[PDB]
């Protein structure tokens, strides 16, 4: 059925690019596959999902989705803040670059014979959680992010960082954690097992509301 | 035809990554299309073709092709360190990182220091005219060149050609050249890849029956 009707859902999803020069950038390795899958069962569910996509050039636009593509942390920032605050659930997946080259060359750059001075990108979902705290995101329900963490555990860190970002809900890479202090393990399985239950979670949620 | 049968070629493509910890690194955008239908009509022209590829733009092992990846530019040089005495013919398309971060971190990392990497076109030229590559009859570079308030696209191209000390240099106008060591400059008109990869070539296979 369709559990995700009437749902208005922003999803972001892939790596960020932070450009050195108009050819060179800093990057991760990450892949946006989990993003999309679940911007995918959205709307496979009923959402009217609009998905903001950093670096993934290779992957399928997911059926029925709204597409907006981004290079930077803070061209990813600019499109959550465009598009938030007409949103009520808000997926954070991407990989967002937490700094940037202080200074971006206009053209190539060719060294003499050399360092990289960084400046720190804003933290775009903590930045959602706070419009919505301060009364500026009144159509939000629900604000999900997420986190691959391996001093303690996989949970210390888990928590910890659930805490630190109060949001609705974490995804831990497996584990789903709720600001109301449920937690249910995430059974290694596939990426569309697992973005079902991160979808079920978000219905679960935004009924209990 | 069938020119480059009995040819060992050697082909760079991509980009390198310079890892800054398991997660992040350093990298451009290069897509790896001219440097893999370079190794593309090299093939089909019966040239028995090596590739090493670092990240491109999802493209697929060309068939017909022996295939090593590599990350960082580091890991580009040592590979071709390998499989160059092997190869007749060496064609440097990849971008290689003149740059790594000089500390790689163990754990996501939570100022990058650069230190620079070797440059391994001019480390093949200077192989060969130490006679420690026989077998090398042409070793081609590439260039992306964009033409500035200092010179137009063939001042940058003769310079880098010069300095590099290659047989064949491919400068992509950021139309292009083709430049060869002994003065020769044919300009590269438009076309698809194929069509250009088969004007490269055919560069080689002249520079080559000349030799
Ligand atoms: N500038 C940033 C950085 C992260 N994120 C969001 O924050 C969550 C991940 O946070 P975090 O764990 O801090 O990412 P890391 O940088 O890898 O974490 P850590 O600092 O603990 O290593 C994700 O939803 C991501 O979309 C964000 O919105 N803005
Ligand atoms: N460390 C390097 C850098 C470049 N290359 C090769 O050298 C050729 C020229 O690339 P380019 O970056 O234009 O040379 P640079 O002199 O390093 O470039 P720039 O003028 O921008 O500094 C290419 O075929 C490339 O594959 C290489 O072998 N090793
Ligand atoms: O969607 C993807 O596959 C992708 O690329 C991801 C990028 N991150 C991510 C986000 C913030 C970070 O700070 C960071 O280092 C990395 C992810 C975190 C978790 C998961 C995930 C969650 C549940 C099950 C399986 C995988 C997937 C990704
Ligand atoms: O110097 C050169 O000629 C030179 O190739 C580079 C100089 N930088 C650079 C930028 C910003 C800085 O602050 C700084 O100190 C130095 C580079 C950064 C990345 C790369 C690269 C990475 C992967 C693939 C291809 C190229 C190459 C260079
Ligand atoms: O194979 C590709 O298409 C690729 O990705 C390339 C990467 N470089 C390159 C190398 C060194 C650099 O410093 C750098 O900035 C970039 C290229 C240079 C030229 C060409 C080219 C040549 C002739 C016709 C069309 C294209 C293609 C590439
Ligand atoms: O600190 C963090 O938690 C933290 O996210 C990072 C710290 N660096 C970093 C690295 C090398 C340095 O020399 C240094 O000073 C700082 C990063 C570099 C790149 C990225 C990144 C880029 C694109 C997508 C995702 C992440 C993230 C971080
Ligand atoms: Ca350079
Ligand atoms: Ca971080």
Redesign the pocket.
């Known amino acids: 059925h369709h559990d995700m009707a009437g749902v208005k859902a922003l999803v972001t999803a892939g ?4 450009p050195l020069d108009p050819v060179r950038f ?3 390795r ?1 892949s946006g596959k989990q993003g999309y899958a679940v911007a995918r069962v959205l709307a496979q569910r009923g959402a009217d999902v609009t998905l903001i996509a950093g670096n993934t050039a290779g992957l399928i636009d997911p059926a029925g989705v709204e597409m907006v593509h981004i290079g930077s ?1 803070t061209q990813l920032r600019d499109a959550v803040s465009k598009h938030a605050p007409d949103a009520n659930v808000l997926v954070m997946a991407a ?5 940037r080259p202080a200074h971006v060359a206009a053209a190539k750059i060719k060294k003499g014979a050399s360092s ?1 001075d ?1 400046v720190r990108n804003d933290d775009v979902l903590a930045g959602a959680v706070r419009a919505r705290a301060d009364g500026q995101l009144p159509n939000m329900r629900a604000i999900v992010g997420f986190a691959a963490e391996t001093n303690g555990d996989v949970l210390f860190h888990a928590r910890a960082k659930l805490e630190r970002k109060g949001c609705d809900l974490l995804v831990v890479n497996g584990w789903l954690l709720s600001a109301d202090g449920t937690e249910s393990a995430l059974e290694h399985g596939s990426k569309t097992l697992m973005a079902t239950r991160i979808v079920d979670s978000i219905a679960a949620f935004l009924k209990s509301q």
Request: glycine content about 12%.
């Open positions: 790596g960020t690019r932070e800093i990057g991760n990450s942390a990989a967002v670059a937490d700094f990289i960084l």
